[PDB]
Amino acid sequence: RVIRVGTRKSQLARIQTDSVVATLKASYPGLQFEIIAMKSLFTKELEHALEKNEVDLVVHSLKDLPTVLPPGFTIGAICKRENPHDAVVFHPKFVGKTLETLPEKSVVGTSSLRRAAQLQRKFPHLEFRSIRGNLNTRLRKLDEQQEFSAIILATAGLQRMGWHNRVGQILHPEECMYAVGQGALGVEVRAKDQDILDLVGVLHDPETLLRCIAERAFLRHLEGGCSVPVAVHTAMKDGQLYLTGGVWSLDGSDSIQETMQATIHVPAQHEDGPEDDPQLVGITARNIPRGPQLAAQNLGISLANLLLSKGAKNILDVARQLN
Numbered sequence: 001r002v003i004r005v006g007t008r009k010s011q012l013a014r015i016q017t018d019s020v021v022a023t024l025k026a027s028y029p030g031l032q033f034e035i036i037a038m039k040s041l042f043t044k045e046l047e048h049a050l051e052k053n054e055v056d057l058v059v060h061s062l063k064d065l066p067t068v069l070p071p072g073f074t075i076g077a078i079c080k081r082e083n084p085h086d087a088v089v090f091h092p093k094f095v096g097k098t099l100e101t102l103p104e105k106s107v108v109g110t111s112s113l114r115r116a117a118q119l120q121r122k123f124p125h126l127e128f129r130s131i132r133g134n135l136n137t138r139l140r141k142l143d144e145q146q147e148f149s150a151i152i153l154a155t156a157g158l159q160r161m162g163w164h165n166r167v168g169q170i171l172h173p174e175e176c177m178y179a180v181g182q183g184a185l186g187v188e189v190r191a192k193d194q195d196i197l198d199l200v201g202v203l204h205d206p207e208t209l210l211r212c213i214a215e216r217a218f219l220r221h222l223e224g225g226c227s228v229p230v231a232v233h234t235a236m237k238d239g240q241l242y243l244t245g246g247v248w249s250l251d252g253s254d255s256i257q258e259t260m261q262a263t264i265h266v267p268a269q270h271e272d273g274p275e276d277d278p279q280l281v282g283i284t285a286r287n288i289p290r291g292p293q294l295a296a297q298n299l300g301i302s303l304a305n306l307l308l309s310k311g312a313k314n315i316l317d318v319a320r321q322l323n
């Protein structure tokens with residue numbers, strides 16, 4: 001009867017879970033949804049819950065899900081993407097500044113290798129430094145202490161907190177391309193639970209799905225391991241899917257970046273697809289035509305092979321061993 005939704009207890013995970021449950025209740029007003037509250041450790045804890053039929057589905061930020069999931073789990077819904085951009089919050093003394101106009105040697109807080117690599121390259125006169133804590137803690141550090149002049153974070157995190165007004169600068173791709181999956185939510189479920197897969201398949205957004213298949217296929221084929229600097233940009237326009245991807249050394253000084261495109265129509269109709277169909281980069285979308293999904297996957301693989309031909313494996317190897 002009731003659909004059990006497991007969640008981490010942190011505030012942003014609860015907000016994300018609530019928003020997905022709200023969309024499910026809009027399609028299914030006659031159904032009961034119960035929220036059960038209980039990093040890579042907690043991902044496995046939620047997977048255990050799901051393996052043991054303690055919960056039926058779990059909501060993650062998509063960028064937080066590896067491109068290979070354990071067997072028995074799949075991503076049963078890619079929700080419509082929120083804003084994928086990275087953003088800057090400034091120290092309060094910096095009224096109306098941007099990263100371009102901060103004094104030289106200002107310290108910017110980020111614990112993302114990806115952001116730090118791209119931003120050191122774009123802003124060589126700033127210092128980029130690790131900062132610890134959840135979003136409320138980083139904002140306190142910034143408001144109360146003098147170490148940091150600014151911090152970097154995902155716009156969609158602040159947006160979900162109701163704190164969009166804290167944003168002082170939205171970074172564009174030439175400054176900082178986003179992480180694979182950033183801004184999309186993914187729902188993880190048991191790989192062979194057909195009732196729940198049909199249920200959450202109403203959440204799939206076809207454009208976001210194809211974009212993220214391509215972003216994820218690209219990342220998987222690079223085989224860089226976790227936490228190397230890799231970033232993407234995707235757009236669907238005029239029948240084309242565009243994928244830009246890049247890799248960087250930790251200090252940003254070495255980089256390879258290329259763009260490929262493919263003719264991929266965004267499907268507007270749901271279709272009743274076959275059940276034997278294997279998942280693509282951990283995603284199961286049986287109600288969306290399969291052809292465009294495979295084409296999005298092939299685009300990511302292609303762009304990854306191009307980058308590897310131009311030397312990406314050596315950049316990723318060095319970055320991985322120096323993190």
Ligand SMILES: *Cc1[nH]c(Cc2[nH]c(Cc3[nH]c(Cc4[nH]cc(CCC(=O)O)c4CC(=O)O)c(CCC(=O)O)c3CC(=O)O)c(CCC(=O)O)c2CC(=O)O)c(CCC(=O)O)c1CC(=O)O
Binds near residue numbers: 066110153179223226
């Ligand atoms: C091998 C491998 N492991 C993973 C899982 C994985 N993903 C990341 C990316 C990551 N996560 C966070 C924290 C965060 N998650 C969501 C938000 C809000 C935005 C949103 O919903 O999209 C946030 C906060 C925020 O971004 O503001 C971060 C940022 C950490 C920080 O700011 O200090 C990042 C890094 C980034 O965006 O560049 C991680 C890293 C976690 C970390 O660095 O703290 C991990 C696990 C790990 O590497 O240990 C993946 C998937 C990565 C992807 O798809 O983007 C992979 C890749 C693979 O399978 O090859």
